[PDB]
């Protein structure tokens, strides 16, 4: 439409001249080959294209052609069980099309255009249809993938296709005004799919880990952040949330991760069994890989692509679970683009619009009742990587004040090989007061009281540990040493979890509540006996110590009897003496 030539190619960004009338964020195709970029400037008659490729080898004088369309995606059947690039290019197809490398200038569609799908009519010629309504259904492997009307569209259905087998190009509905509806449609990523109204979260997001389920919960609309230095497990924990959650779909965005860290998922997940239907686990994953040597603007591109896909599935009706890895890489991409724009930077170089982008990205997550009268959910768990571990970086601070839970990882706990390394006094949760009705309904009746007792005991033992480190853990009284030792038993038998065991990798709510009950009963009887006068060394040599210690390596079938036996054994053995 609007054609101009290159003038000042330098680094990852060019400057095209002779371009008057180009909008402010459309996608241009620079170079003699096509190196799709993006416009962020308008100075008189030039532009400032931002390339998504290598740019090594171009010249001055090669043409640039605008498109006038702001980076759409393709939404429809065919997305599940597949990898993508930063701008939605199928990695499998690029592989079989060029080789083992990723060259520049490859053109491949996002959704397949050859496979047949099982259409199923759901309308009647003459009805009234509005945006977000239902039109049909297409069976993907395990799900009844619906199809929808693109928003801001209406009319009068004139003639639908009967059942059969088509590609994603045959228009299955033809409205009266002439608009034809395919089985897919495009959506610009920087917008937000509209809804009717946003509900209040009232059900937890079970994830398997005893700490992040019992102590610091997250509702099914929430947000979180796992910041910590390198060598803590901001990836092991996210992979465990991706393979042992309670969601329906999962989107795993990697924004500057390791190639090995992303290929150890493509290899293993089509072997495990999702815990809701029995099929493979790779039939609910849409992971979006963008490693650390690919181009630099594809980082922000990948973040927005991931969020828009998750919102599409929420509008469909499932319960998605986004997982953004290392949002700090996004910030450093913005820093580089700012240093190329040659602007005035805020603290530490980060441009003066960081927090706005982060808030707009964290504020499209939550349970909602979409335009079809259903329910969906987009949960987000975004890792954060401080540049020295300090929680004073602008990203580490701006990512507070906007989130729900906050799971601060500690380095020393990760040197001791005490995993997971969740610091139990720097973290917090804000959802733990709206979920109590659900707990009372589906786990126990005094589970809130047990949780309160556990938290109170931990965060009272801390104060005594101060005096311990001052004087020494022998000048203390007997009740004080008992509190210290109960705290240590808790810390090593209820807040520890090895993601590589066979049965200690998915602990459910009843099992956690059982262990808490055992610990509380033991502490109560030991308090009584210490009042009586027996010695703390005998109280510790009581073998119920090792019983309730190893009570976590059990499976989940014989626990309802194991727990009863150990409970009665404690009640007996602590009045025998």
């Amino acid at each position: 439409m609007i054609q101009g030539v290159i003038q000042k190619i330098a680094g990852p960004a060019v400057i095209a001249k002779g371009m008057l009338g180009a909008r402010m964020y459309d996608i241009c195709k620079v170079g003699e080959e096509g190196l799709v970029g993006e416009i962020i400037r308008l100075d008189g008659d030039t532009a400032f294209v931002q390339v998504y490729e290598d740019t090594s080898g171009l010249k001055v004088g090669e043409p640039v052609v605008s498109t006038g369309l702001p980076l759409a995606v393709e939404l429809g059947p065919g997305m599940l069980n597949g990898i993508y690039d930063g701008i939605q290019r199928p990695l499998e197809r690029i592989r079989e099309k060029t080789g083992i490398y990723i060259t520049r200038g490859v053109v491949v569609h996002a959704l397949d255009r050859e496979k047949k799908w099982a259409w199923t009519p759901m309308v009647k010629p003459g009805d009234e249809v509005r945006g977000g309504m239902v039109l049909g259904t297409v069976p993907e492997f395990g799900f009844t993938h619906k199809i929808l009307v693109p928003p801001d569209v209406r009319g009068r259905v004139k003639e639908v296709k009967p059942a059969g087998e088509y590609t994603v190009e045959e228009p299955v509905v033809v409205l009266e005004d002439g608009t034809e509806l395919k089985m897919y449609h495009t959506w610009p990523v920087r917008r937000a799919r509209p809804v009717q109204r946003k509900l209040d979260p009232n059900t937890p997001f079970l994830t398997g880990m005893r700490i992040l389920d019992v102590l610091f919960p997250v509702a099914m609309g929430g947000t979180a952040a796992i910041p910590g230095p390198f060598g803590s497990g901001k990836t092991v924990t996210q992979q465990s949330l991706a393979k042992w959650s309670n969601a329906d779909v999962v989107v795993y965005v990697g924004c500057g991760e390791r190639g090995n860290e992303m290929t150890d998922v493509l290899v293993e997940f089509p072997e495990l069994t999702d815990p809701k239907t029995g099929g493979p686990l790779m039939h609910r994953t849409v992971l979006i890989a963008n490693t650390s040597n690919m181009p630099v603007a594809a980082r922000e591109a990948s973040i927005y692509v991931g969020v828009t896909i998750a919102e599409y599935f929420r509008d469909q009706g499932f319960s998605v679970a986004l997982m953004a890895d290392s949002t700090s890489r996004w910030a450093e991409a913005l820093r580089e683009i700012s240093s190329r724009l040659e602007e005035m930077p805020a603290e530490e170089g980060y441009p003066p619009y960081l927090a706005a982008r982060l808030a707009a990205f964290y504020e499209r997550a939550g349970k909602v009742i979409t335009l079809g009268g259903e329910e969906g959910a987009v949960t987000i768990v975004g890792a954060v990587s401080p540049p020295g571990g300090d929680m004073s970086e602008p990203v580490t601070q701006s990512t507070l004040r906007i989130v729900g839970a906050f799971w601060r990882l500690d380095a020393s706990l990760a040197f001791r090989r005490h995993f997971p390394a969740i610091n139990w006094n720097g973290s917090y949760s804000l959802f733990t007061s709206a979920l109590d009705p659900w707990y009372r309904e589906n786990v126990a009746e005094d589970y809130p009281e047990l949780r309160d007792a556990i938290s109170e005991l931990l965060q009272r033992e801390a104060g005594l540990q101060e005096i311990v480190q001052l004087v020494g853990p022998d000048a203390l009284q007997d009740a004080e040493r008992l509190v210290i030792e109960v705290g240590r038993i808790i810390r090593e038998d209820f807040l520890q979890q090895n993601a590589y065991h066979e049965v200690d990798a998915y602990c459910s709510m009843k099992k956690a509540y059982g262990i808490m009950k055992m610990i509380l009963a033991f502490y109560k009887e030991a308090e009584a006996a210490i009042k009586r006068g027996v010695s703390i060394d005998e109280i510790l040599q009581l073998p119920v110590l090792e019983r309730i210690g190893r009570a976590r390596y059990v499976s989940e079938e014989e626990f309802p009897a194991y727990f009863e036996e150990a409970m009665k054994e404690i009640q007996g053995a602590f009045k025998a003496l």
């Binding site: 190619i9 330098a10 680094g11 080898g57 820093r335």
Partner: protein, 459 residues
């Protein structure tokens, strides 16, 4: 060709030229001056008015009247071959030797072309080193990058030479072809002084491992942008000899701090928004670009594994260089000055040095069914001993419980027998026997990490 005369600015590294738009961005040039001596360059930020060069050697004697710049190649590319498997190069790639240049077989770029995340495979094979603090607690597998966070006067070159000499795979412990696999070193050094270079060369010549290794040398009396160029050449040659001829290479990159210094210097002379404490913003991008070139593909059988030596400047793990390196690689080994004081060797601090690709390369059916469990237990016991050290320093050694003394003595025996090993080649089984001997010094039933079966079988 002698075209493109009319430069108009010279200051330090940079050099500007008047109207020249046919020089492609990122090209290569060569700057002849008024006496015949030819230098090298590289085009940055081409534009319709001028074009900025980046001289390699130096800018002495260059006047503004008799000085030209000619085009050589539109992209940087190294002429690789298989005949360069006994040779010795320098910086850009001229042969510092008594033999003529090579006849190339293919000329590929030196910049990039990353690997496709779907043309990889999980590194699984297990390569032992004979250093019982790396074979047993920080396993090193074939296909992983693992730096060595050295120090000022700490022995890191010796550990690198020892690993290169002792490293061998163990095929008869998981089932494979018995004898097939030697190594192929691609030693690449940027900034080394004379003493260290002479040590490395003596050592490589003693073991006969010199006729199967290529050498790129950038000693300290040479320019700095050559330091910026060297590791890309090294990794290009390595990727070639691996993914084309089924070799198993082991790239030793020495002193990444000098590379980061050259980077900071060009960035400063470019005035490019310092990121954090000097060093520019894109240093994560650059270090990643030259680290992620080491993996394993499917279909082929080659492999590329790295050991980037780097000296944390002031003994700070929070310095940008070690920080970004730790974020990018997968694992690390960290020496200890305190242990170097007390004559230990190798002074590898075992707490802060981990390896990520270990849970997949060790375990039942690969080395022994009790490896990771002994690892976990040794870590826990050593942490307890280290804490009781401070308890002592607060209270006194005679006011201690009866088992705190057991933990203290375990810590001292651990530092005296398991870490200190001289220059001897251990084995996985000898080191596990030593580990079990030590772990037997503590009582039974106080090891909540190992299973009762292994507990009964070994003690």
């Amino acid at each position: 060709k002698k075209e493109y005369t009319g430069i108009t600015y010279i200051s330090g590294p940079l050099l500007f030229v008047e109207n020249a738009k046919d020089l492609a961005y990122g090209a290569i040039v060569d700057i002849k001056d008024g006496t015949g001596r030819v230098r090298g360059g590289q085009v940055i930020e081409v534009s319709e008015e001028y074009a900025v060069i980046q001289v390699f050697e130096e800018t002495t004697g260059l006047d503004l009247a008799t000085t030209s710049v000619s085009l050589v190649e539109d992209v940087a590319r190294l002429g690789v071959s298989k005949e360069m498997l006994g040779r010795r190069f320098n910086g850009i790639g001229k042969p510092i030797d008594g033999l003529p240049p090579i006849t190339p077989e293919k000329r590929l770029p030196i910049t990039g072309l990353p690997l496709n995340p779907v043309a990889r495979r999980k590194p699984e094979q297990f390569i032992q080193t004979g250093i019982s603090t790396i074979d047993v607690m920080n396993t090193l597998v074939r296909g992983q990058k693992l730096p060595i966070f050295s120090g000022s006067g700490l022995p890191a070159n010796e550990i690198a030479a020892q690993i290169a000499r002792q490293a061998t795979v163990r095929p008869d412990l998981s089932g494979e072809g018995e004898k097939e696999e030697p190594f192929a070193v691609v030693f690449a050094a940027m900034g080394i002084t004379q003493r260290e270079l002479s040590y490395f060369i003596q050592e490589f010549e003693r073991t006969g491992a010199l006729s199967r290794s290529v050498l790129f040398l950038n000693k300290a009396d040479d320019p700095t942008i050559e330091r910026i160029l060297t590791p890309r050449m090294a990794l290009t040659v390595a990727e070639y000899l691996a993914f084309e001829h089924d070799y198993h290479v082991l790239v030793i990159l020495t002193d990444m701090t000098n590379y980061c210094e050259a980077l900071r210097e060009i960035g400063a002379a470019r005035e490019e928004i310092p990121g954090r404490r000097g060093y520019p913003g894109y240093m994560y991008t650059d270090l990643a670009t030259i680290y992620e070139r080491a993996g394993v593909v499917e279909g082929k059988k080659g492999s590329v594994t790295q050991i980037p030596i780097l000296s944390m400047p002031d003994d700070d793990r929070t310095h940008p260089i070690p920080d970004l390196t730790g974020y990018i690689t997968e694992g690390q080994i960290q020496l200890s000055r305190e242990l170097h004081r007390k004559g230990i060797y190798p002074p590898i601090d075992p707490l802060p040095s981990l390896s990520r690709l270990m849970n997949n390369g060790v375990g039942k059916g690969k080395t022994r069914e009790d490896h990771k469990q002994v690892s976990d237990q040794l870590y826990s016991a050593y942490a307890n001993g280290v804490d009781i050290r401070k308890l002592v320093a607060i209270i006194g050694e005679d006011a201690l419980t009866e088992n705190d003394r057991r933990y203290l003595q375990f810590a001292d025996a651990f530092e005296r027998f398991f870490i200190n090993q001289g220059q001897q080649n251990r084995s996985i089984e000898e080191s596990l026997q030593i580990a079990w001997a030590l772990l037997s010094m503590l009582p039974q039933g106080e090891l909540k990490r190992i299973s009762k079966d292994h507990i009964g079988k070994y003690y």
